[PDB]
Amino acid sequence: MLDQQTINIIKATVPVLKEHGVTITTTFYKNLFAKHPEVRPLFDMGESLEQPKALAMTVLAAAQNIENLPAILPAVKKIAVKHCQAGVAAAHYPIVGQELLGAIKEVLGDAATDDILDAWGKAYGVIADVFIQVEADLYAQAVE
Amino acid sequence: MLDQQTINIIKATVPVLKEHGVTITTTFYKNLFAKHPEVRPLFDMGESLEQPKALAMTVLAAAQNIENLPAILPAVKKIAVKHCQAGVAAAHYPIVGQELLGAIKEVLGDAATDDILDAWGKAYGVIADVFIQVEADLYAQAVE
Ligand code: HEM
Ligand code: HEM
């Protein structure tokens, strides 16, 4: 699991990121859709591409609860169902992580040291691992 | 969360405990029912008291997966339903922990150093916290 200084950075910095949420969210989606065209179809409705505006902010909310992730399971389970419906794969998670971290770097500016960015990368990984595992079991559940 | 040496002890020792599973299970229940009469009603059927023989071994299985606890969620969810049905409370978990650790001490004998017992206490706490949180949400779900 995560070490203590990692958690401290997360707990210490997540309120900063939340305060600049609109920049995180919009930079995230701008870069996600531009740099990774292959994921655009999963967001295609039906007529502009959908941007589930709570995606990045929900990562931040999970990070707030990083020491008690079971507490967010009712939300995770509901999101997992939409993910499995949409076709989200474990291999997508590093792409979302990359663009989330790019958004975080933009917001933190000067305060964006390597250790703080590394901490957020580690935290995202742990959060992503929860969804991946829950969706893996949902996918397996579907062909019973 | 847990530190690395804790996890090492758990990963290193859980196979030892599994090998002596029958002693863990039977010492656990003997001491649980003798020292904590108030929990006997939750195990009362209907005609001897039920001993869900997999209780302690399931803690050990969770401990095996201590770095990916989401993986055991399908099992946890099913057990949580039985717990909420039976009337299991968050305040029961320290009692089960105490008698589990007593059983572990018995099996490890000489190898039962304070650091190894402390590690198992910490690990049980994290495992217990998962069930507690899942059952808390199930209890709340019931009065919607
Ligand atoms: C920890 C990582 C992630 C979190 C916290 C997260 C969170 C969310 C949230 C809150 C929603 C809106 C759910 C709703 O209210 O219905 C959503 C939807 C969606 N997410 Fe994720 N997400 C994550 C990772 C990903 C990844 C890796 C992909 C891969 C492309 C992805 C693709 C989608 C898509 C396509 C939707 C729309 C579902 C629909 O419209 O039916 N997400 N996500
Ligand atoms: C991490 C801690 C625990 C684990 C891993 C665990 C595991 C289990 C398992 C595997 C079963 C059998 C489920 C089945 O196959 O139907 C069970 C049943 C049961 N457990 Fe737990 N348990 C834990 C904590 C507790 C606590 C704290 C209590 C408090 C008294 C408790 C009381 C019971 C009772 C009364 C049953 C019987 C349910 C029934 O017969 O309907 N357990 N537990």
UniProtKB/Swiss-Prot annotation, chains A, B:
GO biological process: cellular response to nitrosative stress; nitric oxide catabolic process
Matching InterPro entries: Globin, Globin-like_sf, Globin/Proto
Chain residues that bind heme b: Q51, H83
GO MF annotations, alphabetized: FAD binding; heme binding; metal ion binding; nitric oxide dioxygenase NAD(P)H activity; oxygen binding; oxygen carrier activity
Keywords: Heme, Iron, Metal-binding, Oxygen transport, Transport
Domain (Globin) ranges: 1-136
PANTHER family in the cross-refs: FLAVOHEMOPROTEIN
Function: This protein functions as a terminal oxidase.
Protein family (similarity comment): Belongs to the globin family.
Name this protein carries in UniProt: Bacterial hemoglobin
